[PDB]
């Protein structure tokens, strides 16, 4: 008999491997497991953790987001590392020359990077040209910009986007949504 102060046999609650059956992603996890164990640079631990992430935890990083990251002071010649998908952005009309190391590139993103004299890199070419993650810049896409996150924590006076199928007048704009009909939220 032991007076337990915690839950016994509690899992860590973190992914220790990707849920995917992608053999190439398992190869990348094998390489960055070696590089997290044997290098003791914190980049490799971060990249190994980020390789486990799900599709909603790997939002796409736009090329405009990459260019805004290179507009930082002294970050213009770093290697932008996106553990995920790099997507195109037609809203930006001037993309610089840079090295981007990502899992996937869309065709427009790859064309926009290599049109400006840049270079698109996989995460193992990054591992051979920056094994401690020297001169790198990890970028992450926006997580709370997802459409599902609008409805999270829905309640009174939270302003959190009702789960609705059709949107308009007659569709939840009445008693409970204005002073005149009933009350306001």
């Amino acid at each position: 008999g032991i007076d337990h102060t915690s839950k016994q046999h509690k899992r860590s609650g973190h992914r220790t491997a990707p849920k995917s059956d992608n053999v190439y992603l398992k190869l990348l996890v094998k390489l960055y497991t070696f590089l997290a164990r044997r290098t003791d640079a914190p980049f490799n631990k971060v990249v190994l953790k980020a390789l486990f992430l799900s599709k909603i935890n790997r939002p796409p990083v736009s090329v405009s987001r990459i260019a805004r990251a290179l507009k930082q002071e002294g970050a213009a010649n770093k290697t932008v590392v996106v553990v995920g998908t790099v997507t195109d952005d037609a809203r930006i009309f001037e993309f610089p020359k840079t090295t981007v190391a990502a899992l996937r590139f869309t065709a427009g993103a790859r064309a926009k990077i290599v049109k400006a004299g840049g270079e698109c890199i996989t995460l193992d070419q990054l591992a051979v040209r920056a094994p401690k993650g020297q001169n790198t810049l990890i970028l992450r896409g926006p997580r709370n910009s997802r459409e599902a996150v609008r409805h999270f924590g829905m309640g009174p006076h939270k302003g959190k986007a009702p789960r609705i199928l059709s949107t308009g007048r007659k569709f939840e704009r009445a008693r409970g949504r204005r002073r005149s009909k009933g009350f306001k939220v």
Binding site: G1, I2, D3, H4, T5
Partner: protein, 222 residues
């Protein structure tokens, strides 16, 4: 290789230097224990000769053993037992006696037997039941190197320095005592005495303050 032979010779020389340090520290500790004991005895004799009474210094350290099991404990004494790391029956901890811990002991009095440990029972507890906490992972002590690797920043290089920080409640008593995992004691080898355990020691039971009689019980449990 020859460089590996150089590292082996360097390691053995460093080990001899560390053992010389530990040996002279243990000799100094034995000398100060002997002189403090003789000084208290002669202070009592001198006060009896002068006609006065030497009031001994109040005890700075208790050893606390949880004697009552897991079920049917109220939440406040249960929380105090968890904060004193007595999470199972016959678990012992060293507790620094101040007012902030005497009112913990008063709260968990019906569930523990505590008293004032001597150097002999501290030495036997740390020698036989002495385990560390290293990556929390309960490492058996067994070697002065794993005490130097964790308590060496506080100047503790050996199991005797660790014992010294307990018996003389040192500046780093908290760190040494929290390095010590709670002592998993057995049931006492000659019984408890006491046909029923859960009355006070004054009333013929086991719990409560057992001032200098905790050494007999803990040596039976060890």
């Amino acid at each position: 290789a020859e460089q590996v032979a150089a590292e082996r010779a360097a390691r053995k020389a460093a080990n001899k230097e560390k053992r010389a340090i530990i040996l002279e520290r243990n000799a100094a500790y034995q000398k100060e224990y002997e002189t403090a004991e003789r000084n208290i005895i002669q202070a009592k004799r001198d006060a009896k000769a002068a006609g006065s009474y030497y009031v001994e210094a109040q005890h700075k350290l208790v050893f606390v053993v949880r004697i009552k099991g897991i079920n049917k404990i109220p939440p406040k004494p249960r929380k105090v037992l968890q904060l004193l790391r007595l999470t199972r029956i016959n678990s012992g901890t060293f507790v620094k006696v101040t007012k902030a811990t005497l009112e913990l002991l008063k709260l968990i009095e019906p569930y523990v037997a505590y008293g004032y440990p001597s150097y002999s029972t501290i030495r036997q507890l740390v020698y036989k039941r002495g385990f560390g906490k290293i990556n929390k992972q309960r490492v058996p002590l067994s070697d002065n190197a794993i005490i130097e690797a964790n308590l060496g920043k506080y100047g503790i290089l050996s199991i005797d320095d660790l014992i010294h920080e307990i018996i003389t409640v040192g500046p780093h008593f908290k760190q040494a005592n929290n390095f010590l995992w709670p002592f998993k004691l057995s049931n006492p080898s000659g019984g408890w005495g006491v046909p029923r355990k859960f009355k006070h020691f004054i009333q013929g039971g086991s719990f409560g303050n057992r001032e200098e009689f905790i050494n007999k019980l803990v040596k039976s449990m060890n």
